[PDB]
Coordinates of C-alpha atoms in Angstrom, one line a residue:
Chain K
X31 CA 4.0 33.7 -0.4
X32 CA 2.5 32.5 -3.6
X33 CA 6.1 31.8 -3.6
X34 CA 7.2 29.7 -0.9
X35 CA 4.7 27.3 -1.4
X36 CA 6.2 26.7 -5.2
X37 CA 9.1 26.6 -3.4
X38 CA 8.1 23.6 -1.2
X39 CA 6.3 22.6 -4.3
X40 CA 10.0 22.2 -5.2
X41 CA 11.1 21.0 -2.4
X42 CA 8.6 18.2 -1.9
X43 CA 8.9 17.5 -5.9
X44 CA 12.7 16.9 -5.3
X45 CA 12.7 14.6 -2.0
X46 CA 10.3 12.7 -3.5
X47 CA 11.4 11.5 -7.2
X48 CA 14.3 11.2 -5.4
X49 CA 13.2 8.4 -3.6
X50 CA 11.0 7.2 -7.0
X51 CA 14.4 6.9 -8.7
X52 CA 16.5 5.6 -6.5
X53 CA 14.1 2.4 -6.1
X54 CA 13.9 1.8 -9.9
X55 CA 11.8 4.0 -11.1
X56 CA 12.0 4.8 -15.3
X57 CA 12.1 8.0 -16.5
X58 CA 8.0 8.1 -17.5
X59 CA 7.4 7.7 -13.5
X60 CA 9.4 10.2 -12.2
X61 CA 8.2 12.4 -15.1
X62 CA 5.0 11.2 -14.1
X63 CA 5.6 11.9 -10.3
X64 CA 7.4 14.8 -11.0
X65 CA 4.5 16.5 -12.6
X66 CA 1.7 15.9 -9.6
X67 CA 1.7 19.1 -9.0
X68 CA -1.1 19.9 -6.7
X69 CA -0.2 16.6 -4.6
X70 CA 3.7 17.8 -4.0
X71 CA 1.9 21.0 -2.9
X72 CA -0.8 20.4 -0.3
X73 CA 2.0 18.9 2.2
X74 CA 2.4 22.3 2.3
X75 CA -0.7 24.2 3.2
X76 CA -1.6 21.2 6.1
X77 CA 2.0 22.3 7.8
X78 CA 1.1 25.9 7.7
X79 CA 0.4 25.3 11.7
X80 CA 3.6 24.3 12.4
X81 CA 5.8 27.1 13.4
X82 CA 9.6 25.8 13.7
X83 CA 10.5 25.9 9.6
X84 CA 12.9 22.4 9.4
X85 CA 9.8 20.3 11.1
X86 CA 7.8 21.9 9.0
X87 CA 9.7 21.3 6.6
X88 CA 10.4 17.7 7.3
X89 CA 6.7 16.8 7.5
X90 CA 5.9 18.3 4.6
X91 CA 7.9 16.4 2.4
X92 CA 7.1 13.2 4.9
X93 CA 3.5 13.6 4.4
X94 CA 3.9 14.6 -0.1
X95 CA 5.6 10.7 -0.2
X96 CA 2.6 9.3 0.8
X97 CA 0.2 11.8 -0.9
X98 CA 2.4 10.5 -4.0
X99 CA 2.0 6.6 -2.9
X100 CA -1.7 6.9 -2.9
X101 CA -2.0 8.5 -5.7
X102 CA 0.4 6.0 -7.9
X103 CA -1.9 3.2 -6.2
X104 CA -4.9 4.7 -7.8
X105 CA -3.1 5.0 -11.1
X106 CA -2.8 1.2 -10.5
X107 CA -6.1 0.5 -10.1
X108 CA -7.8 2.8 -12.9
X109 CA -5.0 1.2 -14.6
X110 CA -5.7 4.0 -17.4
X111 CA -2.1 5.6 -16.7
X112 CA -0.2 3.5 -19.4
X113 CA 2.4 3.9 -17.4
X114 CA 4.2 0.6 -16.0
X115 CA 2.1 -1.9 -13.9
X116 CA 5.0 -3.4 -11.9
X117 CA 6.9 -0.1 -11.5
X118 CA 3.3 1.5 -10.0
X119 CA 3.3 -1.0 -7.5
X120 CA 6.6 -1.6 -6.2
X121 CA 7.7 2.4 -6.1
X122 CA 4.1 3.1 -4.5
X123 CA 4.8 0.8 -1.6
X124 CA 8.4 2.1 -1.4
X125 CA 7.4 5.4 -1.1
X126 CA 4.8 4.8 1.1
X127 CA 7.2 2.5 3.7
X128 CA 9.3 5.7 3.7
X129 CA 6.5 8.0 4.4
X130 CA 5.5 6.0 7.7
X131 CA 9.2 6.1 8.7
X132 CA 9.8 9.5 8.3
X133 CA 6.2 10.5 9.8
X134 CA 6.6 8.5 12.5
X135 CA 10.0 9.9 13.7
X136 CA 9.0 13.4 13.6
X137 CA 5.5 12.6 15.9
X138 CA 6.2 13.0 18.9
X139 CA 4.1 9.8 19.9
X140 CA 5.1 7.0 17.2
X141 CA 1.2 5.0 17.7
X142 CA -0.3 7.9 17.0
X143 CA 0.9 7.6 13.2
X144 CA -1.3 3.9 12.5
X145 CA -3.8 5.5 14.9
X146 CA -4.7 8.4 12.8
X147 CA -4.1 6.0 10.0
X148 CA -5.9 3.3 10.9
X149 CA -8.8 5.1 12.8
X150 CA -11.0 5.2 9.9
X151 CA -9.3 3.4 7.2
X152 CA -12.7 1.4 7.1
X153 CA -14.5 4.6 6.0
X154 CA -12.2 5.5 3.3
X155 CA -11.6 2.3 1.7
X156 CA -15.4 0.9 1.8
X157 CA -16.4 4.7 1.0
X158 CA -14.1 4.1 -2.0
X159 CA -14.9 1.2 -3.4
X160 CA -19.2 2.6 -3.0
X161 CA -18.2 5.3 -4.8
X162 CA -17.1 3.6 -7.8
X163 CA -19.9 0.5 -7.9
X164 CA -22.9 3.0 -7.1
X165 CA -21.6 5.5 -9.1
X166 CA -23.6 8.7 -8.4
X167 CA -27.0 10.3 -9.5
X168 CA -27.7 13.7 -7.9
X169 CA -25.6 16.3 -6.0
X170 CA -27.0 15.2 -3.1
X171 CA -24.9 11.8 -3.6
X172 CA -22.3 12.6 -5.3
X173 CA -21.3 14.9 -2.3
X174 CA -21.5 12.4 0.6
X175 CA -19.4 10.2 -1.7
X176 CA -16.4 12.7 -2.3
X177 CA -16.6 13.4 1.3
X178 CA -15.1 10.4 1.7
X179 CA -12.9 9.4 -1.4
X180 CA -11.8 12.9 -0.8
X181 CA -12.4 14.7 2.4
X182 CA -12.0 11.4 4.7
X183 CA -8.4 11.3 2.5
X184 CA -6.7 14.5 2.6
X185 CA -8.6 14.6 6.3
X186 CA -6.2 12.0 7.8
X187 CA -3.0 13.6 6.2
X188 CA -4.4 17.3 8.2
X189 CA -4.4 15.0 11.4
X190 CA -0.9 13.4 10.9
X191 CA 0.4 17.4 10.3
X192 CA -0.9 17.9 13.3
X193 CA 0.7 14.9 15.3
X194 CA 4.1 14.5 13.9
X195 CA 4.0 18.4 13.4
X196 CA 5.0 20.0 16.2
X197 CA 3.0 20.4 20.1
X198 CA 0.8 23.0 20.2
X199 CA -1.6 22.7 17.3
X200 CA -5.0 23.0 16.7
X201 CA -5.7 19.4 16.0
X202 CA -9.4 19.8 14.8
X203 CA -9.3 22.8 12.7
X204 CA -6.2 21.7 10.4
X205 CA -8.5 18.1 9.6
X206 CA -11.2 20.7 8.7
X207 CA -9.6 22.3 6.3
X208 CA -7.9 19.9 4.7
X209 CA -11.7 18.1 4.7
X210 CA -13.5 21.4 3.1
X211 CA -9.7 22.1 1.0
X212 CA -10.0 18.6 -0.1
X213 CA -13.9 18.5 -1.6
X214 CA -13.2 21.9 -3.1
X215 CA -10.4 20.5 -5.3
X216 CA -12.8 16.9 -5.9
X217 CA -15.1 19.3 -7.9
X218 CA -12.7 21.4 -9.2
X219 CA -11.6 17.8 -10.9
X220 CA -14.6 16.3 -12.2
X221 CA -15.3 19.5 -13.9
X222 CA -11.6 19.2 -15.8
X223 CA -12.0 15.2 -16.1
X224 CA -15.5 15.6 -18.2
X225 CA -13.6 17.8 -21.2
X226 CA -10.3 16.8 -21.1
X227 CA -10.3 13.0 -21.0
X228 CA -13.9 12.2 -21.4
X229 CA -15.6 10.8 -18.4
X230 CA -19.2 10.6 -17.6
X231 CA -21.1 8.1 -15.5
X232 CA -21.3 9.6 -11.8
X233 CA -19.2 12.5 -12.6
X234 CA -20.4 16.1 -11.1
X235 CA -20.1 17.8 -14.7
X236 CA -22.2 15.6 -16.2
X237 CA -25.1 15.3 -13.7
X238 CA -24.7 19.5 -14.2
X239 CA -25.4 18.5 -18.2
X240 CA -28.2 16.0 -16.9
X241 CA -29.6 18.4 -15.3
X242 CA -30.0 16.1 -12.8
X243 CA -27.7 18.7 -10.7
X244 CA -28.4 22.5 -10.5
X245 CA -25.9 25.1 -11.2
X246 CA -27.0 27.2 -8.2
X247 CA -26.3 24.6 -6.1
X248 CA -23.0 23.5 -7.0
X249 CA -21.8 27.4 -6.6
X250 CA -23.9 27.3 -3.5
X251 CA -21.8 23.3 -1.9
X252 CA -18.5 25.6 -3.7
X253 CA -18.9 28.6 -1.3
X254 CA -20.3 26.6 1.5
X255 CA -17.1 24.8 1.3
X256 CA -14.9 28.0 0.8
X257 CA -16.7 28.8 4.6
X258 CA -15.8 26.0 6.4
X259 CA -12.3 25.9 5.0
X260 CA -11.9 30.0 5.8
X261 CA -13.3 29.2 9.1
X262 CA -10.8 26.8 10.2
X263 CA -7.7 29.0 9.1
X264 CA -9.4 31.3 11.1
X265 CA -9.9 29.2 14.4
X266 CA -6.9 30.3 16.9
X267 CA -4.0 30.8 16.5
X268 CA -4.8 30.2 13.1
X269 CA -3.4 30.4 9.7
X270 CA -3.8 33.9 8.0
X271 CA -1.3 32.6 5.2
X272 CA -3.7 30.1 3.6
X273 CA -6.5 32.7 3.6
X274 CA -5.6 33.8 0.0
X275 CA -5.1 30.1 -0.9
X276 CA -8.5 28.8 -0.2
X277 CA -10.1 31.7 -2.1
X278 CA -7.7 31.1 -4.5
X279 CA -8.8 27.6 -5.1
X280 CA -12.3 28.1 -4.8
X281 CA -12.3 31.1 -6.8
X282 CA -10.8 29.4 -9.4
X283 CA -13.7 27.0 -9.9
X284 CA -16.2 29.8 -10.0
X285 CA -14.3 31.5 -12.8
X286 CA -12.7 29.3 -14.9
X287 CA -14.2 25.6 -15.1
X288 CA -18.0 26.6 -13.4
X289 CA -18.7 28.6 -16.6
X290 CA -18.4 25.5 -19.1
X291 CA -21.0 23.3 -17.0
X292 CA -23.2 26.1 -17.3
Chain A
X31 CA 0.7 -30.0 15.1
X32 CA -0.2 -30.6 11.2
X33 CA -3.3 -30.1 12.5
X34 CA -2.6 -26.9 14.7
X35 CA -1.7 -25.1 11.7
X36 CA -4.8 -25.5 10.0
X37 CA -6.1 -24.4 13.2
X38 CA -4.5 -21.3 12.6
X39 CA -4.3 -21.5 8.9
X40 CA -8.5 -21.0 9.7
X41 CA -8.5 -18.2 12.5
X42 CA -6.3 -15.9 10.3
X43 CA -8.7 -17.2 7.1
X44 CA -11.5 -15.8 9.8
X45 CA -9.5 -12.5 10.8
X46 CA -9.2 -11.3 7.4
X47 CA -12.3 -12.6 5.2
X48 CA -14.2 -10.8 8.4
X49 CA -11.9 -7.4 7.5
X50 CA -12.0 -7.7 3.4
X51 CA -15.8 -8.1 3.9
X52 CA -16.6 -5.3 6.1
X53 CA -14.8 -3.0 3.9
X54 CA -16.7 -4.0 1.0
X55 CA -14.9 -6.6 -0.5
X56 CA -17.4 -8.6 -2.8
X57 CA -18.6 -12.2 -2.9
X58 CA -15.5 -12.9 -5.4
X59 CA -12.5 -11.1 -3.3
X60 CA -14.1 -12.8 -0.3
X61 CA -13.9 -15.9 -2.1
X62 CA -10.5 -15.4 -3.5
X63 CA -8.7 -14.4 0.0
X64 CA -10.3 -17.1 1.7
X65 CA -8.1 -19.5 -0.8
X66 CA -4.7 -17.9 -0.2
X67 CA -4.3 -21.0 2.0
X68 CA -0.5 -21.0 1.8
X69 CA -0.5 -16.8 2.9
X70 CA -3.1 -17.4 5.5
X71 CA -0.9 -20.1 7.0
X72 CA 2.9 -19.0 6.8
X73 CA 2.5 -16.8 10.0
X74 CA 2.5 -19.4 11.7
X75 CA 5.4 -21.0 10.7
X76 CA 6.8 -17.1 11.7
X77 CA 5.1 -17.0 15.1
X78 CA 6.5 -20.8 16.0
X79 CA 9.0 -19.2 18.3
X80 CA 6.3 -17.1 20.3
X81 CA 5.7 -18.3 23.7
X82 CA 2.2 -16.8 25.0
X83 CA -0.2 -18.5 23.0
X84 CA -2.3 -14.8 22.3
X85 CA 0.4 -13.2 21.6
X86 CA 1.5 -15.9 19.2
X87 CA -2.2 -16.1 18.0
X88 CA -2.4 -12.0 17.8
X89 CA 0.6 -11.8 16.1
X90 CA -0.1 -14.5 13.5
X91 CA -3.1 -13.3 12.3
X92 CA -2.0 -9.5 12.4
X93 CA 0.9 -10.5 10.0
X94 CA -1.8 -12.8 7.5
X95 CA -3.3 -9.3 7.6
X96 CA -0.6 -7.8 5.9
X97 CA 0.9 -10.7 3.6
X98 CA -2.3 -11.1 2.1
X99 CA -2.6 -7.0 1.6
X100 CA 0.3 -7.5 -0.2
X101 CA -0.7 -10.4 -1.9
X102 CA -3.5 -8.2 -3.2
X103 CA -1.6 -5.2 -4.0
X104 CA 0.6 -8.1 -6.3
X105 CA -3.1 -9.3 -8.1
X106 CA -3.4 -5.5 -8.7
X107 CA 0.2 -5.2 -10.5
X108 CA -0.2 -9.0 -12.4
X109 CA -3.6 -7.9 -13.5
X110 CA -4.6 -11.2 -14.9
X111 CA -6.6 -11.9 -11.7
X112 CA -10.3 -11.1 -13.6
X113 CA -10.9 -9.7 -9.8
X114 CA -12.1 -5.8 -9.6
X115 CA -9.7 -3.4 -10.1
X116 CA -11.0 -1.2 -7.4
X117 CA -11.9 -3.6 -4.9
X118 CA -8.0 -5.0 -4.7
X119 CA -6.9 -1.4 -4.2
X120 CA -9.0 -0.2 -1.3
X121 CA -8.7 -3.5 0.4
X122 CA -5.7 -4.2 0.0
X123 CA -4.8 -0.5 1.6
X124 CA -7.3 -1.4 3.9
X125 CA -5.6 -4.6 5.5
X126 CA -2.4 -3.0 5.2
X127 CA -3.4 -0.4 7.7
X128 CA -4.9 -2.9 10.1
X129 CA -1.8 -4.6 10.1
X130 CA -0.1 -1.7 11.2
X131 CA -2.3 -1.0 13.9
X132 CA -2.3 -4.5 15.0
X133 CA 1.2 -5.1 14.6
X134 CA 2.7 -1.5 16.5
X135 CA 0.9 -2.4 19.5
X136 CA 1.7 -5.9 19.9
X137 CA 5.1 -4.8 19.5
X138 CA 7.4 -3.8 22.7
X139 CA 8.9 -0.7 20.9
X140 CA 5.9 1.0 18.2
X141 CA 8.8 2.5 16.0
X142 CA 10.4 -0.9 15.5
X143 CA 7.8 -2.2 13.0
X144 CA 8.0 1.0 10.6
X145 CA 11.9 0.3 11.0
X146 CA 11.7 -3.3 10.2
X147 CA 9.4 -1.9 7.5
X148 CA 11.5 0.8 5.6
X149 CA 15.0 -0.5 7.0
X150 CA 15.4 -2.0 3.6
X151 CA 12.4 -1.4 1.4
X152 CA 14.3 -0.3 -1.5
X153 CA 15.7 -3.5 -1.5
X154 CA 12.9 -5.3 -1.9
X155 CA 10.8 -2.7 -4.0
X156 CA 13.6 -2.3 -6.1
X157 CA 14.0 -5.8 -6.4
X158 CA 11.2 -6.6 -7.5
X159 CA 10.9 -4.0 -10.0
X160 CA 14.0 -5.4 -12.0
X161 CA 12.8 -8.9 -11.6
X162 CA 10.0 -8.3 -14.0
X163 CA 12.4 -5.5 -16.4
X164 CA 15.6 -8.1 -16.6
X165 CA 14.1 -11.6 -16.6
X166 CA 16.5 -13.8 -15.7
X167 CA 18.3 -16.5 -17.6
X168 CA 20.1 -18.8 -15.8
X169 CA 19.9 -20.7 -11.8
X170 CA 22.5 -17.6 -10.7
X171 CA 20.1 -15.1 -11.9
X172 CA 16.9 -16.6 -11.3
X173 CA 18.1 -17.1 -7.6
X174 CA 19.6 -13.3 -7.2
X175 CA 16.0 -12.1 -8.2
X176 CA 13.7 -14.4 -5.9
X177 CA 16.1 -13.6 -3.2
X178 CA 14.7 -10.4 -3.3
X179 CA 11.1 -10.9 -3.9
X180 CA 10.9 -13.7 -1.8
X181 CA 13.6 -13.7 0.7
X182 CA 13.9 -10.4 1.6
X183 CA 9.9 -10.2 1.7
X184 CA 9.0 -12.6 3.9
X185 CA 12.3 -11.9 5.8
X186 CA 10.6 -8.8 7.2
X187 CA 7.8 -10.6 8.0
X188 CA 9.3 -12.8 10.1
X189 CA 11.5 -9.6 11.2
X190 CA 8.3 -8.1 12.5
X191 CA 7.2 -11.4 14.1
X192 CA 10.3 -11.5 16.4
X193 CA 9.7 -7.7 16.8
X194 CA 6.0 -7.8 18.0
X195 CA 6.2 -11.5 19.1
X196 CA 7.6 -10.9 22.5
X197 CA 10.9 -10.5 24.9
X198 CA 13.3 -12.9 24.2
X199 CA 13.2 -14.3 20.5
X200 CA 16.2 -15.2 18.5
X201 CA 15.4 -12.6 16.1
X202 CA 18.3 -13.4 13.4
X203 CA 16.7 -17.1 13.4
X204 CA 13.6 -16.1 12.7
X205 CA 14.2 -13.9 9.5
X206 CA 16.6 -16.7 8.3
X207 CA 14.5 -19.5 8.5
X208 CA 11.7 -17.1 6.9
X209 CA 14.1 -16.5 4.0
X210 CA 14.7 -19.8 3.4
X211 CA 11.9 -21.3 3.8
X212 CA 10.2 -17.8 1.3
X213 CA 13.1 -19.2 -1.5
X214 CA 11.8 -22.6 -1.0
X215 CA 8.0 -21.7 -1.9
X216 CA 9.7 -19.3 -4.7
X217 CA 10.5 -22.2 -6.9
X218 CA 7.9 -24.2 -5.5
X219 CA 5.9 -21.7 -7.5
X220 CA 7.3 -21.3 -11.0
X221 CA 7.0 -25.0 -11.6
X222 CA 3.6 -24.9 -10.9
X223 CA 3.6 -21.8 -12.8
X224 CA 5.0 -23.4 -16.1
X225 CA 2.3 -25.9 -15.8
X226 CA -0.9 -24.4 -14.4
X227 CA -0.7 -20.8 -16.2
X228 CA 1.8 -21.5 -19.3
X229 CA 4.1 -18.4 -18.3
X230 CA 7.6 -19.0 -19.5
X231 CA 9.9 -16.0 -19.5
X232 CA 12.7 -15.9 -16.9
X233 CA 10.5 -18.7 -15.1
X234 CA 12.7 -21.6 -14.1
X235 CA 10.8 -24.8 -14.9
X236 CA 11.3 -23.2 -18.5
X237 CA 15.3 -22.3 -17.7
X238 CA 15.5 -26.1 -17.2
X239 CA 13.3 -27.0 -20.2
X240 CA 15.7 -24.5 -22.3
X241 CA 18.7 -26.7 -20.5
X242 CA 19.8 -23.3 -19.4
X243 CA 19.6 -24.7 -15.7
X244 CA 20.8 -28.1 -14.7
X245 CA 18.2 -30.2 -12.9
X246 CA 20.8 -31.4 -10.5
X247 CA 21.8 -27.8 -9.6
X248 CA 18.1 -27.1 -8.8
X249 CA 18.1 -29.9 -6.6
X250 CA 21.4 -29.0 -5.1
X251 CA 19.6 -25.2 -4.4
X252 CA 16.5 -26.9 -2.6
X253 CA 18.5 -28.9 -0.7
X254 CA 20.9 -26.1 0.0
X255 CA 18.0 -24.2 1.3
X256 CA 16.4 -26.9 3.6
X257 CA 19.8 -27.3 4.7
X258 CA 19.5 -23.0 5.9
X259 CA 16.1 -23.8 7.2
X260 CA 16.9 -26.7 9.4
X261 CA 19.4 -24.7 10.6
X262 CA 17.7 -22.0 11.6
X263 CA 14.9 -23.9 13.4
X264 CA 17.8 -25.7 15.2
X265 CA 19.8 -22.4 16.7
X266 CA 18.5 -21.9 20.5
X267 CA 16.0 -22.4 22.0
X268 CA 14.9 -23.4 18.5
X269 CA 11.6 -24.3 17.0
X270 CA 11.4 -28.1 16.8
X271 CA 7.7 -27.8 15.4
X272 CA 8.9 -26.7 12.2
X273 CA 11.3 -28.8 11.5
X274 CA 8.6 -31.6 10.0
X275 CA 7.0 -28.6 8.0
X276 CA 10.4 -27.8 6.2
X277 CA 11.1 -31.1 5.4
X278 CA 7.1 -31.2 4.4
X279 CA 7.7 -28.8 1.7
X280 CA 11.3 -28.8 0.4
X281 CA 10.3 -32.4 -0.3
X282 CA 7.3 -31.5 -1.9
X283 CA 9.0 -29.7 -4.5
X284 CA 11.2 -32.9 -4.9
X285 CA 9.0 -35.1 -4.6
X286 CA 5.6 -33.6 -7.0
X287 CA 6.9 -30.7 -8.9
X288 CA 10.1 -31.2 -9.9
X289 CA 9.9 -34.6 -11.7
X290 CA 7.9 -33.2 -14.3
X291 CA 10.6 -30.8 -15.4
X292 CA 13.4 -33.4 -15.6

């Protein structure tokens, strides 16, 4: 297995850069995206409940298209990227439309896509604006912040995976998994991002340094998330394949990232 | 009539700012959007072939949502706006999703929306990237540039208006009208933009100043576009209401803008 997830990570990486390029992506931008490993890979975990190998691989790639799309729109707003402003926007919009197209023809009911995508957009976009306006000060906040720009974000994709992915999928469980996993990745981020490229206002690693957030509680949260996740992959039929993955990621924060800010 | 188009411009301005705000738009951003008059108004012209007053008003507002959406994504890339980076992106994405939702429930066949939206995206996004990479040098170019980032852009919306707008619409004519009108607005732009906020590389007003573009030809192009437009509103059944509008806009470039760079 810890292979096939690289196999997908690879296919999707192709399909995406294929697009990025044929729309006018420059060497730098195709490079940039080709290197967005986690993004390219997550669509795999979300489609895990899909039995047909082809549909599964079709949705998997379709979702990567949109996840990278959003990722570029993000670089457009942080603007640190140093990448070209124009390319970013156009390629972003291009990938997005293609994803919409693809996801929509994979889904049993075409309406479902825009439904899922709209049905809580207000929360995710607002959630994201607030997150950066009133930067958080203690784990109770940071958490509620990350539970929108992170959980609700990937959560939607999971919801999509279930609808496009083919009849007989435990809709809620996929979503639940997505949300837990998403937040675990979020924290994983902030801890890499405090060191790797000095960031600090409302950043979980700082709130730990500043003694505003309890090491024991970060760990508690982490594990509570591993709980939520593992639980969902367990709901019937279930995704036994994702169990190693859950532990893999969560374990990684504990083992390699948490030690630094403790 | 030259009333009702302000009546719509008004309704749409509401619906849009209503959204901008309830998603966390700041005073400045709601202000900014509230002021995007032409954008807010164009959806009116495109829905002119729709007979039912309510559907017409529903599609009209739905299209405004996405036109402003793209407009914000544009400010995000030029980044001159001086507006907040984050808000822009989130609000942008928010409006966009809402538009997708709305347009999709108005359309007879839900697939049609993403179809229209995808079916040539490659051309529009690439077209737009190129446009700014190899900035044009003579009317023959500027034109072909503006015929993507401008004509194909609004063209799609017109295509949408026809599909969402309700059975019995001259699909092609709406689109044709849109494209002509779009390019007439484009030139209208570049000429305002050379003076108003000193812009100059690949800008039609400059290519005129630099004697690289013939005054007589700009005028010829202009009028050829009024031709293409008027022709389309004339195809059966036809939009007699748009005839005054066509002339109004095109006339305006001749009368007030062209005199400066001649």
